[PDB]
Design an enzyme around this catalytic site. Structure first.
Site, short mmCIF file in Angstrom:
data_model
loop_
_atom_site.label_atom_id
_atom_site.label_comp_id
_atom_site.label_asym_id
_atom_site.label_seq_id
_atom_site.Cartn_x
_atom_site.Cartn_y
_atom_site.Cartn_z
CE1 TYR A 55 -3.21 3.01 0.48
CE2 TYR A 55 -1.88 3.53 2.43
CZ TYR A 55 -2.85 3.89 1.50
OH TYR A 55 -3.48 5.11 1.56
CG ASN B 119 -0.50 7.71 6.32
OD1 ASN B 119 -1.54 8.29 6.63
ND2 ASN B 119 -0.49 6.44 5.90
CD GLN C 90 -22.83 23.84 54.62
OE1 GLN C 90 -22.12 22.84 54.76
NE2 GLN C 90 -23.73 23.96 53.64
NE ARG D 223 -20.98 24.79 51.57
CZ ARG D 223 -22.08 24.36 50.95
NH1 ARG D 223 -22.43 23.08 51.01
NH2 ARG D 223 -22.83 25.22 50.27
CG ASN E 1 -1.22 2.05 7.25
OD1 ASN E 1 -1.08 1.00 7.90
ND2 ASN E 1 -1.92 2.11 6.13
CE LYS F 55 -20.43 48.47 38.64
NZ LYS F 55 -21.18 47.19 38.88
CD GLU G 261 -9.00 9.46 0.70
OE1 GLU G 261 -8.75 8.70 1.68
OE2 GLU G 261 -8.89 9.07 -0.50
CG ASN H 73 -10.24 5.29 1.93
OD1 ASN H 73 -10.34 4.06 2.12
ND2 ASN H 73 -9.15 5.97 2.23
#
Lengths: 639, 641, 636, 101
Positions: C72, C214, C300, C306, C336, C406, C434, C437
């Site tokens: 390939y 690639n 709390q 917290r 590849n 601010k 593509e 593919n």
């Protein structure tokens, strides 16, 4: 004015009994929703207006097909297989329906309301006489509709390209008596399609040339869902606009935000129109009169301007009005069209080869506008719950008086954020997820049905939010009225104890100002607590009156007799209230509806009903359309 | 028609010389774009139509201020601090500007000068309504700064666009008061502190008077500026995309019927009727539609009866996108032609009265732009694949050696990348409203942020349009070469049938094949017995032997084959070689092809042309980006009514 | 602990002198970031370790291709054209590069920093000996890297990295059309670029074009610097939650080990916060504040303080895991086919989905970090939630002409809103590409670029937050010194005016309890909380006990004689301590002294921009890590 | 809160009993031999103040996500077989060089 147009839609929705289907008379989104929701609403398929063009079209198709003419989906394969030819005319149409009965039932379906609506639109599309469907099939459709018979239809499987192929195949399925298609007869009964046709005295059809394709090749389900979505969006929009007014009243807003000139200089039609409505709603409001008094006390220590969720509501609404109005027009255009391919032009002897995209895009836009509507309601709701921003209102709209065991609408506040968060997430677009579909033959497709269902889900949540908002505002109406009644009691007790203990004119004046000026919900919990704002101010004033008169027995006596009388008289007026300015308000119809017709009361620890029970009644009245009665009442005379 | 309207915008963009700012004459998005992009365009502030009312308002505000009237942002604090009062009128105004000079320059990002100058224009125009309280002198300085190409360097980010684009406009204010920490550009290279910029154009720093800081910062001018040039470009690219659907129909051998007026009459979305009416007109006398009809009459019953959706359903697809872009233009213009300010001075009635549309509509336009991009991706995808392209070679590779010619494959890959990012950008901004500014700004439109994302989406659309137009000129050439090649094949086969003395039956079959077999399936090696020309010839030879059976025939057939492999390849090469150094001439799209090929100096792409795909598409994109693409567009549409 | 691993990455980024590229030595996100940001960092391609295998692989590919092996992209077409075969080995490779030079320059390009990182990663992939690339090409890459030469690369075109990597290939083969930078200023055509560093254009051999293009070296390159920054900014946010606790008067109890004891990120961030606050002088003030009128103050803290450790937990995990995933991709052969010469075969697979997906996850975590910062900042700006601090952290004392931070508050909302929008996923937009593919593709480069933009904004938010917090340190310290003046003034005047023990005590209490910034604007205003409180107590004392009324009136008179002047004096002194004992001293010192800032007010001429910009620049360029490491030293 | 409301026999809370039966909460409690609770200190908050519903749905989600993932993985093999794929794409050395687990 869009207010007129929407009132027109609501009136049509309630008043219609007969939907005329004839290929010229327009069907509006109000008509679609009325058929879907009121079963006494019947369809009338008018033979004198369109039977001729239908039978001509149908016969043209059948003849042309038999003489071997080369016509798409009539003598050729479908979609990506259009290069294949046949003379098996009927078998071509039946093989189409078979391949498209490909949805799945989960443990979910398109509801009957949607399916019947689709059946309405599909019928109407045939009346333009471009489809080639037989008159008989149309009569069968009209009869299925009026007899409350409809196929059970899988939720998913449409990308809405040239049509809603899979869900419409189920209607075609019922029409040809496929045993595996299940049909509903009313609310209780489910039977196979052959048994369904039999019970309303029809027989299965054998499909002729083009008929399978005519039946599936339209965008009828998306447009069905888009129509009831758009009906509801119009009503809820008018409802949100109106309640911005009620919000101004209860929050102690300045109505000047709605002056026609502010908006004439920045002239968005929806902006002008919503401001115009708001000005009118608030014009001689008895609540604005209390607002004006409130701001005259310590004028210079109070905000000159309201926060954006009130003061910029007309500018926020403007584009939302425009989005919803333009989308209504666009959906109605789709409702009143021949969606089908090929179009049969029998007059000039051609079948025309072309094509749900308008609906997909506009449902995306409306979902974003609904999200904007929910964001406005969230911001208004949030202000109303927080004592720093509510100009006198207690936190969470808790009556108390014992606040440590009464959290008022805290639960509804939490639900509002959850509603608004999911709503914003829902408003991402669907049309940006187009996949190249059907052997790449549908390399664009509208996804209208999926987008319509998401906007429908978005409106469901807005309803929840509108329900909670209106409930909260009736709570606030009650709290403002009680507030007026309480301040008067405090002023009286203070004025009389001043005479009784024989305090000077100066001391009386100074003490009465404190009674008027101190927000009563800051000390209602315990009015003679020396650390709470009533006693704190009175003490400051007393020391001040001691210095100014310098050149005490009575002051100590005044204070002692204050904790003898004050609480008891405050309790009595509240207790009496629990068992008035709203009467002169344009929003009386809403408060009366929620309080009297729905049978609710001011929320507190001494009322056993949960917030859920109260809001549910309001939601249900919104869901089913009853809210439009107080809405039309509140609105009448606006022109 | 939206077409005539968009043609009008382009004409106004090109022809306008002066922008009249007077408080009545409308500014359109083409004017804003013209001002931003053509520095020869001058702003003309007309005193006779509005100076008097500005001074009345100005004087009224100062007077009421000094009397201690209680007026928002004039004798009170701003935003969440409006409960504070002062009689320190000028310091109140300078303190606002100080606190808003709060953006950061990142790594270098900034609003571009085109947007800042546009914002300056819109702020000046807003002032001409005589509601703001600003001095006439401050307006004259703005007109002079605009006309002299001076603008502040403004940070990219910091605005939520509530009542105003507060932080960015503070930079325009910072320039007018000559804050030394505010840097200004003069033209493209020069950067100096604000006092130096003002001196270089003969102005002196202003001292802010009552309400003046607020007047400068309290509208939605930056979002509206960006959205204006966004809407101008959206209108242009929309038209381009609609027109190029026609050109796509020509090169892909589409059926023009998709655009027939009755289909759209029965489904009358305004954009649907109008886009199709344009398409029908564009393809009426097409010589490519003539080749198309000819192509479908060969092996008719082995060929699609309909095109794919990216062609066939383009009018329906476009309709809502036309409506979205056209309605958004009206909305943005309405915003341009308004007094965006608060409070409004109503000096006539002796009172002071106390960016949402653009945010939502920018979100909607970004969705429409992603849709246009999806249309382009799908068309381009069909064009690249020999299964769907009706005779074109894969990737539009000319070859003839296809193993070393990948054609427009790289462009195809990039089109996927462009479309994917584009679909991502089209998520809404308006759904991300935060409760802002001490919860005083609990709704806000985010219009500037949204406008910026729509601008980026349009930037991607330009790339896709450039590549698509480039691929279509490639396809035009391939179609013309195809026609010429098929003629050579027919001629050679015809003359060899005679030379070899073949029967009329044989001659008929052999000529049919030469006509019927797509040339690009065997171009790489025309005499290869395993490729479709020879296969088809061999099939017809067996058929002719069997049909004439009731010898020397076989002898002559063998001779035909021998002489074909001596003469055919050479004659095909020659015609191709000739083509490398016609039907487009009768086409409405000649102006595009002529523009791309001759004006931009390109050629059919192949292994023999040394220019990269980059170099070809760069030219087309630069033309689209700078407006030169509107000349072929206007030539092509010349006469449409 | 993730905290040690992050200091490990920061140390490495600072110290690395050399990047050894040899086929076994791992490259970390810190090495990538260092090569990209510090130009004195050099690549050393170690021949002794990997030249042998590269040459073996190169030769195998060349010989097999000449023999006519069906492999390939070597004797076949690329992608969807893989059914086409050729013996024209070189031309095949050249036509792939030609076709891929298809980007456009808009008005924009990948930065040199990314481009050089991509070249590094590509070089590294080659050293594994699977590519069939020639050793000579690798030496040319090292030489290009070490000489500051890199191609100008278009921004867009990869679905993940064919197009962008083709520009690196075009440089190496000397395409006229490819432009190269040499350092900061010079731009010349590729043939001139190679010439200047004494290289010649290559003629591509079998598989070479494909080997160069690639793999996913660009997405991984952007991913690497992105992950480096996300680790650093993560740690910065975690640390500053501790600084937020100090200035807001939070309760350190939220960081207690048993609450969390157990999401690892939750335990670890809490463990850091507990340590940072253990001996805090600010927590000492917090305790004192909450013991004044205890039952009238929140029990709390609000969630943004917290629940910060619980919020941070999944953010820590996401960023740590994504870092491991990017590094795995860095130290791999993305190529590849894979040539396995050892066993005489080419392996046809697809070696970047991991990066695309995790970039989407990390963009969500960064959005999450921003929401936290937004929520804390918001609290800090609002008097109702800041426990004594003035609105907008405005000093004043004239608040009517000082709006403090601010503008920064407004900017923070814009920042956060854009950040949330950015965090929508990219990987959900996969197009069938593509000629179909590449019917799946990772879009990793696009996603990496979005996460990079998200980090840019987070830096903005951190710079503003850190600026607000130093403003808040100054205001707390001024608070404490101001309260002591009021206590002293009230105390001595009570004596001078000869009020009883009862009165003196009640007045002392009021001075201690009333939040100073509610009256600083005009301390003797009868309508403001100080005199309101003193009048309440004076009335109380009169009842519970004449000529006392005389002595109180004289008290109230001498107060508007002494008080304002003495408060003015301490503040003026302050503008011209507890932070000294705080773990956060290095940050305060860095911002105030090293960056030369000061408490913001109407009297300080620097705009907020001028102040925040400095803090931003220091975050952007890495100087912020010096105070960060100092503050953290000793944490084990 | 609906779970707490059941435990304390709120009449407005409906309960499911199997597939068929829906009854008010006090009658639901009755049938399973239980009596309404009177909430003591912290019991209300202890009942509502956790993330039990989210984690519940998340749990049935993650179980299913595991099963369906493995099914997808397994079905890639089946796709290879029917589409006439090359099984070489799954050779171990390709993946040993890019070792995402």
């Amino acid at each position: 004015s869009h207010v007129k147009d929407i009132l027109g839609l609501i009136n049509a929705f309630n008043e219609v009994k007969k939907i005329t289907v004839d290929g010229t008379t327009p069907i509006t989104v109000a008509h679609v929703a009325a058929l879907a929701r009121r079963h006494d609403v019947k369809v009338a398929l008018e033979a004198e207006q369109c039977r001729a063009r239908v039978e001509t079209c149908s016969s043209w198709v059948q003849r042309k097909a038999e003489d071997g003419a080369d016509i798409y989906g009539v003598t050729t394969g479908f979609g990506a297989c259009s290069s294949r030819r046949t003379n098996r005319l009927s078998e071509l149409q039946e093989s189409l329906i078979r391949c498209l009965l490909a949805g799945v039932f989960t443990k979910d379906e398109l509801p009957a309301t949607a399916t019947r609506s689709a059946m309405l639109l599909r019928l109407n599309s045939f009346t333009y006489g471009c489809s080639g469907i037989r008159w008989e099939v149309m009569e069968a459709l009209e009869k299925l509709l009026n007899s409350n018979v409809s196929p059970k239809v899988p939720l998913r499987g449409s990308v809405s390209a040239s049509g809603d192929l899979i869900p419409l195949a189920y209607i075609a399925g019922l029409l040809i008596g496929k045993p595996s298609v299940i049909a509903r007869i009313g609310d209780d009964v489910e039977v196979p399609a052959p048994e369904a046709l039999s019970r309303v005295g029809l027989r299965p059809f054998k499909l002729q040339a083009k008929e399978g394709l005519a039946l599936v090749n339209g965008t009828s389900f998306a447009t069905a869902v888009a129509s009831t979505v758009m009906y509801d969006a119009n009503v809820l929009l008018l409802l949100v606009e109106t309640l911005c007014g009620m919000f101004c009243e209860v929050i102690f807003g300045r109505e000047e935000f709605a002056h026609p000139l502010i908006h004439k200089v920045k002239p968005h039609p929806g902006q002008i129109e919503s401001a115009e409505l708001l000005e009118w709603l608030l014009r001689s409001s008895p609540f604005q009169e209390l607002s004006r008094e409130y701001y005259s006390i310590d004028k210079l220590k109070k905000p000159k301007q309201d926060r954006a969720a009130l003061r910029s509501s007309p500018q926020w609404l403007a584009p939302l009005v425009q989005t919803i109005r333009d989308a209504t027009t666009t959906v109605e255009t789709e409702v009143n069209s021949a969606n089908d391919n090929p179009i049969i032009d029998h007059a000039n002897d051609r079948a025309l080869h072309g094509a749900g995209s308008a609906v997909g895009f506009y449902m995306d836009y409306v979902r974003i506008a609904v999200a904007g509507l929910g964001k406005l309601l969230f911001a208004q709701f949030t202000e109303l719950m927080i004592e720093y921003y509510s100009n006198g209102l207690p936190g969470n709209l808790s009556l108390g008086p014992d606040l440590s065991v009464d959290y008022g609408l805290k639960g509804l506040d939490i639900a509002m954020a959850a509603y608004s968060s999911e709503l914003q997430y829902l408003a991402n677009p669907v049309t940006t997820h187009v996949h190249s579909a059907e052997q790449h033959n549908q390399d664009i497709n509208s996804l209208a049905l999926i987008s319509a269902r998401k906007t429908e889900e978005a409106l469901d949540i807005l309803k929840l939010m509108i329900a909670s908002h209106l409930t909260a505002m009736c709570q606030a109406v009650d709290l403002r009225q009680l507030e007026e009644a309480l301040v008067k009691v405090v002023e009286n007790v203070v004025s009389t104890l001043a005479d009784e203990c024989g305090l000077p004119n100066d001391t009386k004046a100074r003490l009465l100002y404190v009674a008027k000026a101190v927000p009563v919900y800051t000390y209602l919990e315990s009015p003679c607590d020396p650390t709470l704002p009533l006693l704190l101010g009175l003490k400051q004033s007393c020391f001040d009156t001691i210095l100014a008169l310098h050149k005490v027995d009575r002051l100590a006596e005044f204070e002692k007799r204050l904790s003898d009388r004050l609480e008891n008289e405050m309790t009595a007026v509240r207790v009496l209230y629990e068992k008035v300015r709203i009467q002169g308000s344009k929003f009386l119809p809403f408060y009366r509806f929620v309080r009297e017709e729905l049978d609710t009361g001011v929320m507190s620890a001494r009322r056993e009903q949960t917030p859920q029970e109260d809001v549910q009644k309001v939601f249900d009245a919104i869901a089913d359309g009853r809210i439009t009665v107080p809405l039309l009442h509140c609105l009448q005379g606006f022109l």
